[PDB]
Symmetry: C2
Subunit: 191 residues, 2 copies
């Protein structure tokens, strides 16, 4: 369903807002991302007191979900952020990963973030960026049907499960129907 | 006019408009028969840019690679949708193994990856999937058009269409 002006930052009523000490979840996201693959995790993270930083190519830009149900404002350009400043990384699916994996900046960000050991949450097509960063050979994960073959070709050990957690870092799921489990493990690693 | 040949086309919604219409136009001008295949005959699928509309001629369940002379695989998001269904993957695998000409452009090669019939074959593809084509064992080349063993014709983007169509027509003749 349509989600009117979704917001992903701590509300002006948050007690954690002023001190600015919240954990930060980076999100590589562009047009045609799977709507709920952003709004659901984002809403859970926000309710948990974590901040969400959307990253694309132009700060202030508005990107729209594949279903047109959600539109989100981009907080930062990938040129002005570093994997270092974030605690975790979210990679929503839809056609967003396809658009982003053709840009070395996002692939490098994903690679460096993964190599930092920090938690990464990738759902549906999201893993495509992990493939491009080439950091999943020998690691356990799942993904949406059409790319299962690509994940395997990338040397990863595929599992058909609602959620897969590798070394308490990589959290992957298959579809929006796995969101409950996806969010559970993501939150767990953030706590 | 040479011997007319039936060209199968695996296509669904959100395909890259010109990646179907340009080759189709060129193929028809040469007297060839273009046959579109999806899940349900009679359906109308539209291109990613809402410019091209395509009536589906056949259901993947009612056709065999044997009845066609060649296969066209347009890009866009169509291959992503199709490669999630064994029927189209099997059709692609079987078609390639038959030795008949296959023309795949932009994202089109994704169905070839899924069919797992490109290890050791030369080809090109759109930027975002280069790593996937390489992981599949293919020998990647960044050229406007790549023809492997006079069968597999691949191109990167719509701007490569002239070369793409040229080689496809060449193999059809």
């Amino acid at each position: 369903s349509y989600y009117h002006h979704h917001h992903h930052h701590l509300e002006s009523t948050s007690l954690y807002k002023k001190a600015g000490l919240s954990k930060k979840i980076a999100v590589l996201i562009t047009d045609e991302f799977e709507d709920s693959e952003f709004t659901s995790p984002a809403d859970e993270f926000r309710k948990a007191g974590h901040e969400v930083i959307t990253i694309e190519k132009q700060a202030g830009k508005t990107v729209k979900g594949k279903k047109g149900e959600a539109s989100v404002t981009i907080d930062k350009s990938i040129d002005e952020v570093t994997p270092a400043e974030f605690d975790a990384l979210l990679l929503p699916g839809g056609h967003s990963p396809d658009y982003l994996r053709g840009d070395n900046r996002f692939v490098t960000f994903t690679r460096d973030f993964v190599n930092s050991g920090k938690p990464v949450f990738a759902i549906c097509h999201g893993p495509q960026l992990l493939i491009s960063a080439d950091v999943i050979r020998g690691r356990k994960l799942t993904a949406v049907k059409p790319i299962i073959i690509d994940v395997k070709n990338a040397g990863a050990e595929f599992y058909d499960q609602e959620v897969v957690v590798d070394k308490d870092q990589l959290v992957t799921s298959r579809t929006p129907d796995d969101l409950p489990a996806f969010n559970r493990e993501a939150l767990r690693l953030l706590g």
